[PDB]
Design a protein around this ligand. Structure first.
Ligand SMILES: CC(C)(COP(=O)(O)OP(=O)(O)OC[C@H]1O[C@@H](n2cnc3c(N)ncnc32)[C@H](O)[C@@H]1OP(=O)(O)O)[C@@H](O)C(=O)NCCC(=O)NCCS
Ligand SMILES: CC(C)(COP(=O)(O)OP(=O)(O)OC[C@H]1O[C@@H](n2cnc3c(N)ncnc32)[C@H](O)[C@@H]1OP(=O)(O)O)[C@@H](O)C(=O)NCCC(=O)NCCS
Ligand SMILES: CC(C)(COP(=O)(O)OP(=O)(O)OC[C@H]1O[C@@H](n2cnc3c(N)ncnc32)[C@H](O)[C@@H]1OP(=O)(O)O)[C@@H](O)C(=O)NCCC(=O)NCCS
Ligand SMILES: CC(=O)N[C@H]1[C@@H](O)[C@@H](C)O[C@H](OP(=O)(O)OP(=O)(O)OC[C@H]2O[C@@H](n3cc(C)c(=O)[nH]c3=O)C[C@@H]2O)[C@@H]1O
Ligand SMILES: CC(=O)N[C@H]1[C@@H](O)[C@@H](C)O[C@H](OP(=O)(O)OP(=O)(O)OC[C@H]2O[C@@H](n3cc(C)c(=O)[nH]c3=O)C[C@@H]2O)[C@@H]1O
Ligand SMILES: CC(=O)N[C@H]1[C@@H](O)[C@@H](C)O[C@H](OP(=O)(O)OP(=O)(O)OC[C@H]2O[C@@H](n3cc(C)c(=O)[nH]c3=O)C[C@@H]2O)[C@@H]1O
Ligand code: NA
Ligand code: NA
Ligand code: NA
Lengths: 145, 145, 145
């Protein structure tokens, strides 16, 4: 089976064997999470969400509607995603922009992923990076400081 | 009335009709929150705080003493604010620096708002931006990467 | 004694007099926390962790295995740390990289601290900074925007 912490609010039944979901996580009903994932404390996971097997999501991350995470992905702490390029309060998109983080990619701590983004297989996103364009497979990207 | 999630700690009675406050939020007694707001999971809202109507605060945001949010503002996930330009542990300011986010402005995911800042009506702050100076009304600002 | 909020999960007994640990914090058993600390809501503190006296950790911060915080340090909200320079899901380091934040240093809101980093005594890290190199004692560092 899987481990859902008593201090998490997990509403999805679509959770793979070996997955751990930690304290103060919210997971909404339609989320799909594969096997042997680690969803660390203080994460939010919405409905139109697919997360593969062996995915690590460190603390303080939100996976919105329109975000897909493939197998073997690492997401660092306080990483953000997004599904709305020009957000205005109460102006709901007719269709959320999709992001996909492809198999084996890693996203460093506190990176910011713009909407509509593909990060290729086995890419490495530097800590604190702002990703405004697709990142090719196996590429190391970071923002110049 | 308003919706306070059972897994939130909301101590303020000053909350407008239609407002939703989600799991694992903390709202301290003197906070004022208007009507039809959405305070998403994992937010902290302090005492000397005014939030208008139709405000969206996405997950993982803290609204400190000295921060005012006007009507129709969008605040993206993991956005930070601040009320102390030269912070030192246990050195409490005599007066917190004030920030105001004016009506209809939007702040992108993981943006950082320095203390003493005005963001003008209907401004758009890019995801991951560091805002060290006021942003004029209706201006799109982002940090060069 | 110390104050552990009923809505925190604090598993460590190694907590100094006068320390406050707030709602929705997780503190694992081996963490050491000194006297008169303030661990604000939504923090995660791991096992191989030493935090000194009079330390302020604002909301939304994680202190990982391998991180030491000395006395009188201020850590701003949504700051990230890290102990793995080339993270890949399920590829556990044989030894976590160590970070030390030396006495009296301050780290601004939403800063990102790379692994293996020393921040010197009384340094000041700008809000949103990415710290990829040691910061000398008493130096003010920020990332060019
Ligand atoms: C991107 C990364 C993999 C690069 O490592 P690297 O290729 O060994 O690069 P180097 O350390 O040799 O740095 C090369 C240059 O890039 C800069 N740089 C490295 N990482 C950077 C980052 N994340 N953001 C901005 N600049 C960065 C360095 O300052 C250095 O600049 P210089 O040549 O002017 O001295 C690494 O720095 C990183 O960000 N890792 C992610 C860590 C993380 O978040 N892990 C999960 C949580 S623990
Ligand atoms: C700022 C923003 C509105 C700009 O959109 P835009 O005006 O269409 O700009 P473009 O996509 O045409 O990009 C123009 C340039 O600015 C850069 N840029 C855009 N947004 C940026 C950002 N947030 N930070 C740094 N650079 C950015 C692009 O890389 C591009 O560079 P180039 O000309 O060298 O190719 C948008 O990118 C953004 O950040 N939106 C906020 C999304 C968000 O956080 N929503 C809430 C959560 S879903
Ligand atoms: C770094 C800091 C201490 C510098 O303050 P300062 O020395 O008075 O510097 P100034 O305000 O005079 O700014 C000098 C320049 O650096 C830039 N700058 C200042 N802080 C910056 C930051 N954090 N990131 C990027 N640039 C910054 C300014 O835009 C200004 O640029 P300019 O000369 O082109 O106009 C302050 O800006 C800061 O970041 N404080 C931390 C606030 C915080 O996070 N507190 C805890 C939460 S409330
Ligand atoms: C800083 C960082 O992200 N480093 C990671 C990287 O090196 C990576 C390759 O391995 C580790 O990440 P994992 O999440 O896979 O660690 P693991 O040892 O499987 O699980 C411990 C994590 O679980 C989460 N957790 C654990 C417990 C016991 C808890 O109560 N609440 C909880 O949220 C957070 C812990 O860091 C490291 O933490
Ligand atoms: C990524 C992003 O910020 N996009 C937003 C933007 O497009 C914006 C214009 O609309 C949406 O934001 P809202 O917060 O207004 O969404 P809404 O549909 O009103 O409410 C769903 C949000 O409520 C919060 N929520 C919801 C539930 C059911 C919950 O259990 N816990 C909870 O925290 C987080 C959800 O994303 C989008 O999420
Ligand atoms: C924006 C910022 O970090 N500014 C700080 C800086 O000026 C610094 C020098 O002083 C203050 O930080 P402290 O954390 O030391 O504030 P303090 O007055 O001791 O405690 C209030 C904080 O405690 C935390 N807290 C408090 C209560 C009552 C709670 O329910 N849940 C809780 O998480 C968050 C509050 O901001 C300021 O908040
Ligand atoms: Na819009
Ligand atoms: Na000070
Ligand atoms: Na590795």
């Amino acid at each position: 089976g899987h481990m859902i912490h008593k201090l998490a609010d997990v509403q999805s039944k679509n959770i793979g064997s070996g997955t751990r979901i930690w304290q103060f996580c919210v997971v909404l009903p339609s989320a799909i999470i594969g096997e042997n994932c680690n969803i660390c404390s203080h994460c939010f996971i919405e409905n139109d969400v697919k997360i593969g097997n062996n995915v690590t999501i460190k603390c303080g991350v939100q996976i919105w509607d329109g975000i897909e995470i493939e197998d073997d992905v690492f997401i660092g702490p306080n990483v953000t995603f997004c599904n709305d390029k020009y957000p205005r309060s109460k102006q709901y998109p007719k269709e959320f922009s999709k992001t996909i983080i492809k198999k084996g990619a890693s996203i460093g701590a506190n990176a910011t992923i713009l909407p509509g983004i593909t990060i290729g297989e086995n890419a490495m996103i530097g800590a604190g990076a702002i990703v405004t364009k697709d990142v090719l497979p196996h590429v190391t990207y970071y923002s110049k400081i």
